[PDB]
UniProtKB/Swiss-Prot annotation:
Residues of the full protein shown: 504 to 629 of 878
Superkingdom of source: Eukaryota
Protein's name according to its UniProt entry: Multiple C2 and transmembrane domain-containing protein 2
Disease: Heterozygosity for a 2.2-Mb deletion at chromosome 15q26.2, encompassing MCTP2, has been identified in a 10-year-old girl and her 3-year-old half brother, who had both coarctation of the aorta associated with dysmorphic features and ventricular septal defects.
Record function comment: Might play a role in the development of cardiac outflow tract.
Family membership noted in the UniProt record: Belongs to the MCTP family.
Subcellular location: Membrane
Residues annotated as binding Ca(2+) 4: 29, 81, 83, 89
Classification lineage: Eukaryota, Metazoa, Chordata, Craniata, Vertebrata
Length: 133
């Protein structure tokens, strides 16, 4: 038991993500509401947040931990909008290199679409943290 689990390569660190919430979220329906959701995808594993209905600003406030295989990786949080039988739609994205991760400060990351060159609509607040084994 005491012995460790030595064997598989030693990871460089761990990326701790914390989904706070979303502000100024575009409205899919005419009424003025939507059922968006945050979907974290890194390396090979992926995790999403609880889907909130009848709310333009879902207070996710969740946490997600993923192994850091390559320090040259980049986490991307794509928020879509679930529409019943119909599949989810793309409502902007956010690309941020782990390196950038300096401190656990609330840094707002505007939702930029494939054309990062410009913006899309509203912004988001994601709190990430870089850890080292």
């Amino acid at each position: 038991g005491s012995s460790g689990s030595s064997g598989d390569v030693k990871d460089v660190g761990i990326l701790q993500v914390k989904v706070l919430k979303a502000a100024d979220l575009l409205a899919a329906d005419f009424s003025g509401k939507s059922d968006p959701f945050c979907l974290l995808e890194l390396g090979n594993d992926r995790l999403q947040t609880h889907t909130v209905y009848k709310n333009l600003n879902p207070e996710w406030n969740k946490v997600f931990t993923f192994p850091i295989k390559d320090i040259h990786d980049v986490l991307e949080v794509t928020v879509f909008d679930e529409d019943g039988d119909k599949p989810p739609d793309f409502l902007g994205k956010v690309a941020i290199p782990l390196l950038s991760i300096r401190d656990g400060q609330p840094n707002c990351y505007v939702l930029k679409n494939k054309d990062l060159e410009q913006a899309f609509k509203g912004v988001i607040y994601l709190e990430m943290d870089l850890i080292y084994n």
